[PDB]
Design an enzyme around this catalytic site. Structure first.
Site, PDB file in Angstrom:
ATOM      1  N   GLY C 132       0.836  -1.207   0.000  1.00 52.02           N
ATOM      2  CA  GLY C 132       0.000   0.000   0.000  1.00 52.02           C
ATOM      3  C   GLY C 132       0.872   1.259   0.000  1.00 52.02           C
ATOM      4  N   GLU C 367      -5.112   6.944   1.558  1.00 52.09           N
ATOM      5  CA  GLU C 367      -4.698   8.137   0.846  1.00 52.09           C
ATOM      6  C   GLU C 367      -3.327   8.627   1.316  1.00 52.09           C
ATOM      7  OE1 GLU C 367      -6.444  10.183  -2.517  1.00 52.09           O
ATOM      8  OE2 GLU C 367      -4.962  10.990  -1.039  1.00 52.09           O
TER       9      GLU C 367
END
Ligand SMILES: Cc1cc2nc3c(=O)[nH]c(=O)nc-3n(C[C@H](O)[C@H](O)[C@H](O)COP(=O)(O)OP(=O)(O)OC[C@H]3O[C@@H](n4cnc5c(N)ncnc54)[C@H](O)[C@@H]3O)c2cc1C
Ligand SMILES: Cc1cc2nc3c(=O)[nH]c(=O)nc-3n(C[C@H](O)[C@H](O)[C@H](O)COP(=O)(O)OP(=O)(O)OC[C@H]3O[C@@H](n4cnc5c(N)ncnc54)[C@H](O)[C@@H]3O)c2cc1C
Ligand SMILES: Cc1cc2nc3c(=O)[nH]c(=O)nc-3n(C[C@H](O)[C@H](O)[C@H](O)COP(=O)(O)OP(=O)(O)OC[C@H]3O[C@@H](n4cnc5c(N)ncnc54)[C@H](O)[C@@H]3O)c2cc1C
Ligand SMILES: Nc1ncnc2c1ncn2[C@@H]1O[C@H](COP(=O)(O)O)[C@@H](O)[C@H]1O
Lengths: 239, 313, 387, 386
Positions: C132, C367
């Site tokens: 990620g 994010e």
């Protein structure tokens, strides 16, 4: 195919929590968020729903006070109103302004702009008056359809349902007319983002009460604005 | 000034509107022959009552077909036509839909600023009203040749329906105007949230068959019927009525808490009701703080006693 | 020229609509959707009807062509009602951004156009089960084979992942491990009903529960070559360019939630009495509310600053990663304190604050996490001082 | 309109002058002045010449008439160099503010005018040995006594106390202890060589040592009725009113020193090596640097905002107390942090950061402590919910 004139008032947003001036002359009313009195929203809404049914050529939105009242006319423009009129009164004389002066302004205007119909909200939440509609209707000598829950054109007559104390009375009115929107009348629409943009194009003539031939001087005056404070006694102390 | 006052009656089905008695009370404050105008199609039935009323010098009667549904385009010149012949200082009514509709037009015809919904009277040129959903109290020194205003009903007392006796003259006439016509009507136990009069029972009622006493009364107050979460949970009522934090948030005119201790979680569903009633036998019951009005009393004696002070009034 | 912290009258009317819809339509059902974890369709379609979604889409694609600043003021409003629904409709700008910043004229009128016509969702698929934060450890492979590519691999935690018409997809173009990240990845536009694509079951998370999130498996998925974003190796720039315009909006989301937390704690503090006084009369509680108010106001300005910089043509990496790190952080601080002020009630599931604590934790993770935000800020910072 | 975060071209000009002064003239001598603690008379005069002092005086009186947002700009640049120096300069605006906002044209032409014509100093006298935060606790007495009042009492911690031409003074003019703040205090302008005024020794503080801070007593000091600010008993309203336009600037002072702390620390991390690597290349130190950057940027915006609010017409009280509260705290965090990065050197006087730490504590104390700031914010905040 009618011409409609909607009156919109810039008021102190109901979701604000209001506060009294220290010198108790009035309330505190600077930088405080304002908006369109929510009955006016319902009035703009009906002007537009009539238009939508193709029973109306045009819709003018109109507002009386400072230059901040232009934000209010821009909202109505976004909602479907075709074009604006602002009637500038400095914040000064705006404070000592009331339904009488407005009714005069609108009476002169409706006449000036060859309109068939004047739409107002039932009342304004700042002064809680409920007079302008009635009062405008008197100065034009048109019939008034106050507190409307429903409206129809039957040609050169308006069928007006209205909210009275026991329930709903129905009326018919010769048709230059004056109708004040009640809560029940409709659900106002959203200022759609696209149309907020589209409304920035549409025009707004900006004028004075002095022009239309209206005074303004007022034999009312506010003295003060303070703050609010067996079953045989109880039905007595409800009564 | 030589100052007469004039109350515009309100009425229907041969019956005076109560709010008119409240307005007559306020009229007497100004000091000066309260004359009262009864206009309509079948007046005198009602004009005879006003005559028995306390404080009413003249009962002016205006009977005409054209007044069907008391339209303010007809009654406006009626009212100006009396005012020319009598020259009143004051012209008012009860601040109902009828009164609210009529008077501002009268003002505009007389060209005076009218005053709406008054709750007190410092004097004949000075009145007190409420603004911003009643979050302030404004006070107004009106200086008009004519004082035009309506009157909050429960700001004043109904003057005696019998008491004084009052002359009754024929009122001056108007020409039918006929730009408006009345057509129709429709009159009316509400849904809970939209309403203006809520009754609610707590755990103190003790059963759901015991809630008959709360309906008994919520037909006298053409009213809504809610409850606490503790009345729901105990089996008394279904869930769609629970007022409070997990239930329907309400804030009508009138909220009656019956046998409700008043936990913060129930106060959160209704501390915004304009007016709040509190009948609860325990005296240190949280509910009292938030209630404008209340009694430290058994509800089975106090409530069926209230439904019997509103069968008549 | 001149500092101004006052909106355009246009933005005011935007904010007013966003806010009418938030208080009126989102809030009254937001707990309901958090409880059932159902995807909030009627609201998304309403927001789309109001013009509140796909706000970046340019005018020549039937869009409104609006700023990063506008998104932020809008989305703070939606978030205040619920970050689950705000995230849902935020997923669209995320998936769209690369195409807006990196797509050709047919790519743009194709995949952006349809968003203008119905309310369809799109998503941005980059994260995988093995990477990620380290975007450059993406291992989903993409091979050229004639007029098209063959995408093989597995993507995790994708917003709108099972609700999207199409995907922005980033995948490893070059087998050479010596390959520079900057040139090692290709980014695609990948319709969701392509064969090979296997969307997974709904992921059940602690928070923003009504938002849709799921894994996707790509097997032998044929992607037409004329949906490649700029070229081979180009993806990494593309994916990274996007954030400039989306990080501010995520931060603006966080303050939404923080503001909600603040109001909920301030209302209760004005009702609840302890020891014969309102909670606001307890200096510790005032001190608490003050600090919450401080953190919100600065969080707000920070995202306002980042939105303004990119809207001014400048890039905003420094300011935007400031806004996300701070907003993320103070959204969490504010969620717990709101719980704390409410007390026992705050820990309960019918009061509205407990959801905020659960919803909030995400803002320190997606994010870009609170750690990698600080590496980004540190890198931009350090660079200002070196030759 | 829209939001903007760009200075106006003329503002950049101010900033440019101020930066160049601070770095070319202040920085080189700031350490000597910290060691010795002598009042920086040259640089004051110099600031005065370049126009970086008395920025609030209207052109009316030969001032440059700038807003709070301009004063903040310049003050941050000066403070970056030195908050001792920059304080002494802001001392003058503190004194001016009550006269600026509440004087008549005589009082302004007279006492602000002279500042225009030469680099005179002036001071704000409110704090007392017994009350600081609690301003309604001040006991210094003024008794009306003809066409003049008689001042008695003791003030304390007065910036420029012993370097000033005149004082804003605030005193307890109503002896009835039951009278409110609103009616009990009168605010005066007071010429410094008035007989009775006894100026104390220089005070010796942790930081901003070059600043003149001292005590001062008043023994039957006579002050003409011509020098009362708005009228008898408007002292409180007046003294209070100053804070809207001063606190934003105190916060920019705090931000300046923060910026300096961070700059020193960043230069050092880029050049110092440990375990084979620049300090920059340790994730911990990076994270520190980044967190400090954050704080500064945020602290700066907070002040920029408060200033704009007041320059825009409206009260900035909620906003100015947020900026003070946060800039002040993060200044103290940055400085001890900056010391930390430099390590042993950091703790050492021959390096620049140790000074920053001693300077920065004051910013949680004067002009309203961190705690008082927070009461204000809570008050402003909470009133918005009833
Ligand atoms: C998360 C959460 C949410 C909640 N949400 C709600 C909510 O939505 N709405 C809600 O109502 N509750 C809610 N509650 C419950 C709330 O805390 C209380 O249980 C509730 O308000 C008390 O209900 P009550 O007043 O009907 O019963 P009680 O509190 O037991 O009140 C009974 C009262 O009746 C009086 N009484 C008994 N007999 C008589 C008599 N015959 N005459 C006169 N008085 C009599 C007693 O003196 C007593 O004060 C919630 C609780 C939690 C934990
Ligand atoms: C270097 C320096 C220069 C100064 N220059 C000037 C100047 O030129 N002009 C001038 O007028 N003054 C000046 N001062 C005074 C300064 O502003 C005060 O010290 C400051 O206002 C705090 O007041 P105090 O020292 O009396 O502390 P106190 O008011 O006694 O505060 C003591 C502690 O209690 C806390 N506290 C106090 N009241 C409360 C309560 N309400 N609730 C919770 N906590 C509370 C405070 O935050 C603090 O931690 C200066 C001070 C310094 C240190
Ligand atoms: C008053 C005083 C007395 C002393 N007395 C003695 C003594 O008697 N005997 C003696 O031997 N020494 C003594 N010292 C030296 C002292 O122990 C060193 O200053 C201390 O070990 C820190 O090392 P440094 O100063 O070289 O900092 P540096 O090694 O340069 O480090 C500077 C900063 O970077 C950080 N840093 C360094 N490496 C890393 C890393 N890999 N990861 C994350 N962060 C890192 C440090 O923590 C510090 O914050 C004394 C120092 C002082 C100030
Ligand atoms: N200043 C004003 N400008 C335009 N319309 C107004 C104004 N004041 C009142 N109105 C109209 O009168 C209605 C009720 O006003 P009021 O009689 O003040 O309660 C409003 O809903 C408006 O439509």
């Amino acid at each position: 195919e009618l011409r409609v004139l909607v009156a919109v008032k810039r008021v102190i947003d109901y979701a604000v929590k209001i506060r009294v001036k220290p010198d108790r002359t009035g309330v505190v009313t600077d930088g405080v968020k304002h908006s369109m009195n929510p009955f006016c929203e319902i009035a703009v809404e009906e002007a537009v729903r009539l238009k939508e049914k193709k029973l109306v050529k045009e819709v003018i939105a109109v507002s009386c006070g400072p230059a901040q009242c232009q934000e209010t006319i821009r909202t109505a423009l976004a909602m479907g109103a075709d074009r604006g009129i602002h009637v500038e009164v400095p914040p000064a004389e705006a404070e000592r302004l009331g339904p009488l002066q407005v009714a005069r302004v609108l009476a002169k205007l409706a006449e000036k702009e060859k309109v068939d119909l004047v739409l107002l909200g039932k009342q304004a939440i700042d002064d809680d008056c409920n007079q302008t509609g009635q009062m405008t209707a008197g100065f034009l000598d048109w019939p008034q359809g106050t507190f409307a829950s429903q409206v129809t054109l039957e040609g050169d007559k308006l069928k007006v349902e209205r909210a009275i104390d026991g329930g709903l009375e129905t009326l018919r009115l010769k048709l230059p007319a004056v109708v004040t929107a009640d809560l029940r009348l409709n659900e106002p629409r959203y200022a759609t983002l696209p149309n907020i943009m589209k409304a920035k194009k549409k025009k707004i003539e900006v004028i004075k009460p002095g022009d239309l031939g209206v005074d303004l001087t007022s034999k009312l005056s506010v003295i003060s604005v303070e703050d609010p404070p067996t079953t045989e006694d109880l039905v007595a102390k409800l009564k | 000034r030589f100052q007469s006052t004039l109350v515009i009656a309100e009425h229907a089905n041969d019956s005076l509107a109560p709010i008119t008695l409240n307005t007559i009370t306020a009229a007497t404050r100004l000091g000066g022959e309260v004359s009262c105008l009864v206009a309509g199609t079948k007046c005198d039935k009602v004009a005879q009552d006003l005559c028995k009323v306390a404080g009413i010098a003249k009962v002016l009667v205006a009977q005409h077909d054209v007044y069907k549904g008391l339209l303010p385009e007809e009654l406006t010149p009626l009212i100006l036509a009396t005012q020319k012949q009598f020259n009143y200082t004051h012209i008012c009514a009860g601040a109902s839909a009828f009164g609210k509709n009529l008077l501002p037009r009268v003002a505009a015809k007389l060209e005076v600023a009218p005053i709406s919904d008054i709750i007190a009277i410092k004097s004949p040129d000075t009145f007190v009203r409420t603004i911003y959903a009643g979050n302030a109290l404004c006070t107004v020194k009106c200086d008009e040749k004519v004082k035009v205003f309506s009157v909050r009903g429960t700001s004043f007392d109904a003057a005696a329906t019998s008491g004084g006796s009052a002359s009754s003259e024929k009122a001056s006439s108007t020409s039918p105007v006929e730009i408006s016509e009345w057509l129709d009507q429709k009159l009316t136990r509400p849904e809970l949230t939209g309403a203006k009069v809520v009754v609610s029972g707590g755990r103190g009622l003790k059963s759901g068959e015991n809630f008959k006493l709360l309906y008994d009364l919520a037909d006298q107050l053409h009213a809504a019927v809610g409850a606490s979460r503790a009345a729901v949970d105990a089996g008394f009522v279904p869930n769609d009525m629970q007022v409070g934090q997990t239930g329907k948030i309400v804030a009508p005119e009138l909220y009656i808490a019956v046998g409700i201790s008043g936990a913060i979680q129930h106060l959160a569903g209704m501390k915004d009701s304009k007016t709040i009633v509190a009948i609860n036998k325990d005296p240190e019951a949280p509910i009292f703080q938030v209630a404008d009005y209340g009694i430290v009393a058994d509800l089975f004696k106090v409530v069926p006693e209230m439904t019997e002070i509103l069968k008549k009034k | 020229l001149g500092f101004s912290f006052e909106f355009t009258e246009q933005q005011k009317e935007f904010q007013a609509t966003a806010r009418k819809f938030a208080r009126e339509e989102i809030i009254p059902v937001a707990a309901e959707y958090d409880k059932t974890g159902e995807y909030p369709v009627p609201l998304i379609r309403r927001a789309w009807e109001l013009g509140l979604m796909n706000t970046h889409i340019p005018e020549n694609c039937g869009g409104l062509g609006l700023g990063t600043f506008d998104a932020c003021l809008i989305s703070e409003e939606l978030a205040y009602g619920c970050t689950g629904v705000q995230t849902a409709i935020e997923g669209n700008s995320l998936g769209q951004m690369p195409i807006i910043i990196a797509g050709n004229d047919q790519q743009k009128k194709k995949y952006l156009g349809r968003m203008t016509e119905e309310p369809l969702m799109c998503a941005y698929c980059v994260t995988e089960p093995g990477a990620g934060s380290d975007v450059a450890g993406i291992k989903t492979k993409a091979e050229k084979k004639g007029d098209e590519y063959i995408i093989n691999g597995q993507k995790m935690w994708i917003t709108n992942g099972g609700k999207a018409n199409w995907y922005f997809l980033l995948a490893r173009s070059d087998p050479d491990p010596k390959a520079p990240a900057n040139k090692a990845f290709t980014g695609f536009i990948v319709e969701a009903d392509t064969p090979g694509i296997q969307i997974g079951r709904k992921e059940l998370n602690m928070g923003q529960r009504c938002s849709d999130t799921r894994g996707i498996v790509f097997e032998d998925v044929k992607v037409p070559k004329e949906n490649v974003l700029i070229g081979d190796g180009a993806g990494f720039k593309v994916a990274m360019g996007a954030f400039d315009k989306t990080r501010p909006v995520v931060a603006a989301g966080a303050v939404g939630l923080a503001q909600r937390a603040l109001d909920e704690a301030t209302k209760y503090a004005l009702e609840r009495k302890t020891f014969g006084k309102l909670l606001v009369e307890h200096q510790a509680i005032s001190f608490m509310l003050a600090e919450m108010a401080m953190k919100v106001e600065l969080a707000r300005m920070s995202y306002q600053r980042a939105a303004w910089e990119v809207d001014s043509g400048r890039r905003n990496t420094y300011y935007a990663s400031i806004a996300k790190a701070f907003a993320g952080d103070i959204a969490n601080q504010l969620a717990t304190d709101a719980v704390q002020i409410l007390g026992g009630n705050g820990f309960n599931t019918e009061y509205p604050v407990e959801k905020l604590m659960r919803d909030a934790k995400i803002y320190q993770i997606y994010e870009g996490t609170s750690q990698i935000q600080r590496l980004i800020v540190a890198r931009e910072h350090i660079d200002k001082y070196k030759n």
